[PDB]
Design a binder for this molecule. Structure first.
Ligand SMILES: *[C@@H]1O[C@H](CO)[C@@H](O)[C@H](O)[C@H]1NC(C)=O
Ligand SMILES: *[C@@H]1O[C@H](CO)[C@@H](O)[C@H](O)[C@H]1NC(C)=O
Ligand SMILES: *[C@@H]1O[C@H](CO)[C@@H](O)[C@H](O)[C@H]1NC(C)=O
Ligand SMILES: *[C@@H]1O[C@H](CO)[C@@H](O)[C@H](O)[C@H]1NC(C)=O
Ligand SMILES: *[C@@H]1O[C@H](CO)[C@@H](O)[C@H](O)[C@H]1NC(C)=O
Ligand SMILES: *[C@@H]1O[C@H](CO)[C@@H](O)[C@H](O)[C@H]1NC(C)=O
Ligand SMILES: *[C@@H]1O[C@H](CO)[C@@H](O)[C@H](O)[C@H]1NC(C)=O
Ligand SMILES: *[C@@H]1O[C@H](CO)[C@@H](O)[C@H](O)[C@H]1NC(C)=O
Ligand SMILES: *[C@@H]1O[C@H](CO)[C@@H](O)[C@H](O)[C@H]1NC(C)=O
Ligand SMILES: *[C@@H]1O[C@H](CO)[C@@H](O)[C@H](O)[C@H]1NC(C)=O
Ligand SMILES: *[C@@H]1O[C@H](CO)[C@@H](O)[C@H](O)[C@H]1NC(C)=O
Ligand SMILES: *[C@@H]1O[C@H](CO)[C@@H](O)[C@H](O)[C@H]1NC(C)=O
Ligand SMILES: *[C@@H]1O[C@H](CO)[C@@H](O)[C@H](O)[C@H]1NC(C)=O
Ligand SMILES: *[C@@H]1O[C@H](CO)[C@@H](O)[C@H](O)[C@H]1NC(C)=O
Lengths: 210, 342, 220
């Protein structure tokens, strides 16, 4: 019943700089609040319990402050290892977690390389047709993809997928997959995906003729 | 002075001619009690007490474990893959009071505030040589043959967190419980008679006190949730026999406020030979119960409770009879004491 | 030295039951409460309940009150959680944490199990169909890849040239289609000049269906 709200959902911090995460409680949890680090596909790791007490093994750059309903977790100098998700847990009344905060690596704006892929002839003989729009190595993560079939906007027939922030260049990659039957696919000529991003002065459209 | 930890020695009025198991243990382990115990009232002295961080509890636990591990050997001891078949003689079982004392250089501080919860500052403090006589009565759900609160009913919790492990209710009026195994088919069938008029009145006062601690909300009792029979039932040892009592009728919500809820509450009990040791390492099988009229009259002086967490507590707060942690039993007696070094 | 190891991944049909386990080690098993916490896709961590492995008392959440049961085997130091009448939204990773406690209060978590993936859907085990993402003619270098479509259940691993090619490779997380079958795709950027000369083969393995498919991608 005690709700923990973490702000922001995503925090962009350039390496070496200070990171400050917030956890608000719907009700007073006294000082019974703990922070956890969570890496992708891995169990949460205890960092700080009892609001400000570091767990044995946690480096000194981590610190917790605030009492009552407002809490903060600080990382003085961000390391490569520190860029992960951080959860707050209250254990005053029952046990409830926050939605978490992803600490991404801040970098300069990078425009995506846009690619389009017609469905393979192998897949066409099966009975379905998949068109894939690839957005490669971009930043920030916020992007918009619209499918246009013969200058007609599509909806509810595509699905997107994003990669985790890359270790090397701190960029993201996005994959949009348009799915039609081989009947619908052969009823039209021009297939295009339009991409909107900060790195582009105007939306970029890549297309192909069947 | 300052707070400290040290080895305590025990005192008792044990008898050298008694075959009784607590007397035999105490004649070997404890010294004769002081005929004229002295206590010193320290005027205008405030002292912090914490029953949940008191090592006296740790020492008593070791002593009571040692008492049972020396004197309650079953026939079949089932620990791990080992099946030990040994001789089990029927014993004389009846707990006697034990005093815990400090050696030279140490003194026990006693909190004399009538309404002390067990954790916090005490303004009326005295210093004693030994504690009062405490019977090492091992039981679950209900605290038996203990002491009473001098004034109001007291609710004991560490309260670092609403998620408490055990909630100790210290009663201020004893309620008699009469457990009997009659002389006359089944010799494992027993029952505890309890006066409903008195019990339901006390239990109503308990809910009244729990309201003070939980936002003046509706107090609901409920049967235990999961666990072995030792905690899902009133578990205790009477005359060497292990009793398991269904206390579902003891926490009848309908009897808490008005019909025929008074009169005699008869709890269904059974004597089990195969038990889970509270010490507790593995199981143990004991000899069949002795012939005759096995009887134990006890004073219910406390209740052990568990508050349901992760529930919708908008109007209801649900409590279930708890226990199992025998350390809690000693805390219900040692709460007002702590050891300090001069 | 404290360690919690949970059982393997389970796959069940809707309306069925499942039992997850967790074996403790490195500490006194009966001294620490054991909690079960789940994390549904796109949702926060939620506590289902705990069990005190000593006797052993259980406390469940209101949302799981009549569907789950927690037991322990004190001899093997193992905690079991049986979850009955599974639904689709029960699909989640089920972690296992021990709870630090004082003498009369329950505090935070410290050690966690690796977590158990539990998948609940009406779909049956199906093998993946691997299609090539053929390149053509961008900005110097071109990109190609593989579409791994219609498989169940998770997971599926993808590499390139049997692991020889790593630089520029981007494998996407799976996307659950409306059919009930998962679908992911892997891509890699390579020089368009060294495109018609070198070879590129995505290798796919789907252990839940004994599938091992290697597809070669080349221009049209
Ligand atoms: C308590 O303290 C006051 C002043 O601090 C002193 O006069 C008095 O004697 C002390 N004892 C009592 C019982 O008041
Ligand atoms: C204080 O404690 C003593 C025993 O130590 C007791 O007799 C007395 O009633 C208590 N209260 C007051 C106000 O003295
Ligand atoms: C039980 O309480 C009564 C008073 O109600 C007392 O006279 C009796 O000695 C007590 N018995 C025990 C064993 O504590
Ligand atoms: C016991 O305490 C309750 C309050 O919790 C009070 O109403 C009752 O009168 C007390 N009984 C005795 C005998 O002091
Ligand atoms: C016990 O009562 C005192 C009275 O002031 C209070 O300060 C303390 O917090 C209480 N302890 C608990 C555990 O409720
Ligand atoms: C306890 O019960 C037995 C039979 O059930 C009875 O003989 C005995 O008198 C009772 N004791 C008291 C104190 O009522
Ligand atoms: C614990 O303490 C808080 C405030 O200190 C109080 O509101 C609450 O009722 C207490 N709980 C118990 C069980 O005493
Ligand atoms: C407690 O609650 C009752 C209703 O359940 C209400 O009538 C009463 O005024 C309340 N008292 C306090 C002190 O909150
Ligand atoms: C106690 O008896 C009731 C019926 O009166 C039964 O429902 C309950 O299961 C019994 N207790 C146990 C622990 O079996
Ligand atoms: C509570 O008492 C009533 C009669 O006073 C009885 O009908 C009911 O079964 C009891 N509830 C129990 C034993 O749980
Ligand atoms: C039991 O006690 C209650 C107390 O209010 C009373 O209403 C009821 O009549 C009593 N039952 C009898 C005397 O049979
Ligand atoms: C039960 O206790 C009440 C307390 O007032 C007493 O009057 C009654 O005689 C006792 N025995 C019964 C009701 O059988
Ligand atoms: C409580 O004390 C009485 C008398 O001292 C005894 O008959 C009874 O068996 C004791 N109860 C327990 C549980 O030891
Ligand atoms: C909790 O249960 C009560 C029962 O009447 C209900 O009124 C309340 O809305 C519930 N709380 C919720 C649904 O958050």
């Amino acid at each position: 019943e005690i709700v923990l709200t973490q702000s922001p959902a995503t925090l962009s911090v350039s390496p070496g700089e200070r990171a400050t995460l917030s956890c608000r409680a719907s009700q007073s949890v006294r000082s019974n609040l703990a922070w956890y680090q969570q890496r992708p596909g891995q169990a949460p790791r205890l960092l700080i319990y009892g609001t400000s007490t570091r767990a044995t093994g946690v480096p000194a750059r981590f610190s917790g402050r605030g009492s009552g309903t407002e809490f903060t977790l600080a990382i003085s100098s961000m390391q490569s290892e520190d860029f992960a998700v951080y959860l707050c847990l209250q254990y005053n009344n029952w046990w409830t977690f926050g939605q978490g905060t992803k600490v991404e690596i801040k970098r300069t704006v990078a425009a995506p390389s846009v690619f389009i892929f017609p469905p393979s002839d192998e897949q066409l003989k099966s009975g379905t047709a998949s068109v894939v729009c690839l957005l490669n190595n971009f930043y920030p993560r916020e992007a918009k993809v619209q499918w246009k079939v013969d200058n007609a906007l599509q909806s509810g027939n595509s699905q997107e997928s994003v990669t985790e922030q890359d270790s090397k260049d701190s960029t993201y990659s996005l994959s949009s997959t348009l799915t039609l039957s081989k009947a619908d696919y052969e009823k039209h000529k021009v297939y295009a995906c339009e991409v909107t991003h900060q790195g582009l002065s105007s939306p970029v459209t890549k297309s192909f003729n069947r | 002075w300052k707070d400290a930890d040290t080895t305590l020695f025990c005192a008792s009025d044990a008898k050298a001619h008694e075959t009784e198991v607590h007397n035999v243990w105490a004649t070997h382990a404890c010294v004769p009690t002081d005929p004229n115990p002295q206590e010193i009232h320290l005027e205008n002295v405030t002292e912090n007490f914490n029953m949940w961080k008191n090592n006296m509890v740790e020492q008593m636990q070791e002593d009571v474990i040692s008492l049972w591990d020396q004197s309650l050997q079953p026939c079949v001891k089932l620990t791990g893959g080992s099946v030990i078949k040994q001789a089990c003689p029927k014993i004389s079982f009846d707990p006697i009071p034990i005093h815990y004392c400090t050696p030279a250089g140490y003194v026990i501080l006693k909190c004399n505030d009538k309404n002390f919860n067990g954790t916090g500052p005490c303004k009326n403090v005295s210093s004693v040589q030994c504690t009062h006589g405490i019977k090492p009565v091992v039981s679950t759900q209900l605290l038996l043959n203990g002491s009473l609160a001098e004034e109001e009913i007291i609710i004991r919790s560490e309260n670092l967190t609403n998620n408490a492990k055990t909630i100790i209710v210290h009663l201020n009026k004893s309620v008699e419980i009469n457990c009997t195994r009659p002389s006359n088919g089944d010799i494992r069938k027993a029952y505890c008679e309890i006066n409903g008029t008195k019990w339901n009145k006390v239990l109503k006062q308990v809910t009244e006190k729990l309201k003070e601690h939980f936002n003046n909300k509706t107090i609901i009792f409920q049967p235990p949730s999961g666990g072995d029979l030792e905690i899902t039932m009133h578990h205790f040892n009477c005359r060497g026999e292990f009793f398991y009592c269904n206390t579902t009728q003891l926490f009848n919500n309908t009897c808490i406020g008005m019909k025929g809820c008074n009169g005699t509450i008869t709890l269904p009990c059974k004597i089990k030979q195969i038990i889970n040791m509270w010490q507790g390492t593995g199981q143990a099988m004991y000899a069949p119960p002795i012939d005759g009229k096995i009887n134990c009259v006890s004073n219910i002086t406390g209740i052990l409770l568990t508050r349901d967490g992760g529930a919708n507590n908008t109007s209801n707060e649900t409590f279930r009879p708890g226990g199992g942690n025998i350390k809690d039993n000693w805390r219900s007696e040692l709460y007002k004491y702590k050891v300090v070094q001069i | 030295q404290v360690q919690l190891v949970q059982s393997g991944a389970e796959v069940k049909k809707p309306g069925a039951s499942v039992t997850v386990s967790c074996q403790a080690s490195g500490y006194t098993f009966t001294n620490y409460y054991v909690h079960w916490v789940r994390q549904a896709p796109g949702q926060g961590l939620q506590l289902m309940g705990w069990i005190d492995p000593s006797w052993g008392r259980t406390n469940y959440a209101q949302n799981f009150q009549g569907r789950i049961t927690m037991t322990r085997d004190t001899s093997t130091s193992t905690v079991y959680m049986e979850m009955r009448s599974l639904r689709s939204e029960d699909t989640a990773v089920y972690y296992c944490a021990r709870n630090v406690a004082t003498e009369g209060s329950l505090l935070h978590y410290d050690y966690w199990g690796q977590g158990t993936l539990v998948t609940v859907s009406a779909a049956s085990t199906k093998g993946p169909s691997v299609f090539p993402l053929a390149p053509s003619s961008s900005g110097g270098t071109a990109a190609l890849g593989c579409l791994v479509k219609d498989y169940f259940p998770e997971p599926v691993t993808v590499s390139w040239n049997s692991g020889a090619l790593t630089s520029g490779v981007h494998t996407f997380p799976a996307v659950l289609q409306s059919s009930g079958l998962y679908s992911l795709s892997s891509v890699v950027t390579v020089p368009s000049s060294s495109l018609g000369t070198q070879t590129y083969i995505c290798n796919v393995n789907h252990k839940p269906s004994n599938t091992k498919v290697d597809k070669r991608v080349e221009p049209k």
